[model samples]
Target chain A: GGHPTEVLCLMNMVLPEELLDDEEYEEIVEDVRDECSKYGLVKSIEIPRPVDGVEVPGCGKIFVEFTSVFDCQKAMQGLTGRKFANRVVVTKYCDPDSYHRRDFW
Target chain B: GHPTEVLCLMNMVLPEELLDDEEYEEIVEDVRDECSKYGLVKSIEIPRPVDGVEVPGCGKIFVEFTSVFDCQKAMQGLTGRKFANRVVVTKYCDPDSYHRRDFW
Candidate 1:
């Protein structure tokens, strides 16, 4: 059951309104990193802070990478539905589409 | 000015069905609650899981609650982007939809 499947993770949230302090953002990164470790060997997990000439920054969004499709699948299994700091996170990655580029899968 | 806007949370996993155990459930719920707390929360829902059926499985589809004005405002704010753990969360709730329905 190690079929290689393509996964592209993405998230959206209201800016300025859902903004968190610097500390919160840091924690989010740590959480993702830790979560990735448990699932499999992580490739790349990052948070984008600037958008449309605006700084929409927070623990609202993140991008994750794993060594292989198997690891990715492993990570998704353990991290999809999880709660951190009393707030629930949405972890559903999509396949790449022609419309959007710049995202490294 | 307390306008009620309805927002829907929908997610599509490419190749589809990439959920990882029960923990993934918590992740989805956590994000929803966080979003609801800052904004006025109306309702939220996830699809039911059917087990033991040797048939085509169902994927995860969800929706959230918000005031109408807020929902619209949120949609414009979110487009073609990424969010928590690189997963995409957006506001695309249907109109005239009663915020009362939890599972339909």
Candidate 2:
């Protein structure tokens, strides 16, 4: 199948209690962007913020989109089993449309 | 903030039987690459071959994740998954035990 770009999402890194404020979430996004940018050209980073009325799993997760699959695969391999913020980080290929659909729903 | 079960590992059993070295390598690489797409991978171990699946660990694969979180996602995304005409079964691997006790 053809994908527009190779995107990867990191989940379960932050607990519900960890998200104390919007500023904290922004810090996380910044940190992730900074770290992932070292591996390749990071096109965009989307860390969905929590909404008052919606209970969604997208919150506290980080999505990094790369310009190419090669770069994305490299980032995935390099970040695999690595530690960030005292937590063992995990990454996976993300469907860009999934993120859009979730916000719509 | 209490954590859930410490399943920082998983195991996969394939339905296809009797794989030669070429087939074994192919399958191992395929599974490893596919699984890595979901989360961080610590290691992928496929036990040595045996005749007609006589050994307990033969034809089995063990994948260690960096964290329980990664393991859970892989488990959820992979269970009952279809690959090359095989429906895969993936489950948590107790770090203390496995099909081969020596594999620890």
Candidate 3:
């Protein structure tokens, strides 16, 4: 209910459209990684799929965590004002601490 | 033409799609003060539009440093940090870039 300790986390980005299926998400991981790696060391990439009765921002979005904030800074700069598959890619930093306190587990 | 000195702003965006004018000014002031801790800030630019037209560079804040040296140190000191509830991201801005300075 209340705010929790701030946790630095992988950069969580919002996509303009949701992927069609798991296969589609799997297919794009490398593509997403390739584009992101250009800015920094990409630690990991997570694309959340739709779950029945589960309402969250995870759907239709991609969360990437780079090795350093420096990389995240660069990636956000480069990725903003750009489009992927005709959809504008909007990015924001996710709180690892807040996620741990909630459904991110 | 090349200028020897350039200003780099920690280009950052807010978490929300829209914020009221009062809230926006509060953020601008807060960020300006926070950034001053690392270096000398020549100016603070929050490019959020008051009018209806949406441009490519709107809704982001830019903090200008006095020198490239100061900007560099500030970059190291501030990159990927959180400010005003969003993770602060930065990029270098050229005086000749397409983004117009009139808004600032």
Candidate 4:
């Protein structure tokens, strides 16, 4: 992630098939929180998905919320090699304001 | 422009122009042909406009490569380069997001 913001958009963690599942969703939230907590305080984690067949704007991406940009930046650098279900993670800096506005696109 | 397997090239295709089947395919072929100059381009996605449906990532081209190494090479070469009278902006995308069809 290149930008300096509290929201880090992560990809490759949750698969399309897995996100469609309720049980797998919870497991992924836990894992993501656990892995991100290592860097700093995780304010919140938002994993947008299609709710009951309605397409979510930012589906298939992980949005990590941190208390500060420093923490977010640290996580961005730290999570580079981190693996989720044997999948390597990739990250990008997303706007927290836009995220809050629900404009994931 | 972080390094990843998906290389995002923006400002090339326009949504209106993408609506044309002939033009769209031509653009796709042009993009694919030129992109192959860098390395192995596994696949490419140019979000086309659909009637009565708002596309998620309109007017942008997504190129998926075999490796980040090759993607980076293309990024360096593509950054600020001109294509279709517009400057090409390159960025690295998470392969998972690309596969899952998340362009933004």
lDDT of 1 by residue, B1-104 (tens): 23345544433332123345565576567646655544665555444343443222123334344456655555554422444333433435444443444322
DockQ for all models: 0.07, 0.05, 0.15, 0.04
Worst 10 residues of 2 chain B by lDDT: B1-10
The better candidate by lDDT, 1 or 4, is 4
Per-prediction TM-score, please? 0.39, 0.47, 0.57, 0.50
> lDDT tens digits, residues A22-55, model 2?
7887888788888888889888877766567444
| Clashing pairs for predicted structure model 2, backbone only | none
Per-residue lDDT over B1-104 for candidate 3, one digit per residue giving the tens place of the 0 to 100 score? 22212333333553253357777777777777877786777776665543445444564566676777776666666664344444445556674452356432
Question: What DockQ results for candidate 3?
Answer: 0.15
Lowest-scoring 10 consecutive residues by lDDT in candidate 3 chain B?
Answer: B1-10
Tell me the tens digit of each residue's lDDT in model 4 across B7-56: 87754565667877998999999889888888998999988877666566
Q: lDDT by residue for model 1 over A33-88, one digit each (tens)? A: 78677867765665655555555433346666566666765565555434344223
**Candidate 2's residue-wise lDDT over B2-46, tens digit each?**
222222222233324325677778877887787787677767677
Relative to the unseen true structure, what is the C-alpha lDDT of residue B89 in candidate 1, on a scale of 0 to 100? 38
Instruction: Kindly report the docking quality category of candidate 3.
Output: incorrect
The regions of model 1 sitting more than 4 angstroms off are: A1-20, A51-59, A85-87, A94-101, B1-104
lDDT of 2 at A77: 52
Once model 2 is optimally superposed onto the true structure by TM-score, how far is the C-alpha of residue B53 displaced, in angstroms? 39
Which residue pairs does candidate 4 place in steric collision?
A: none
Each model's lDDT = 0.46, 0.59, 0.56, 0.75
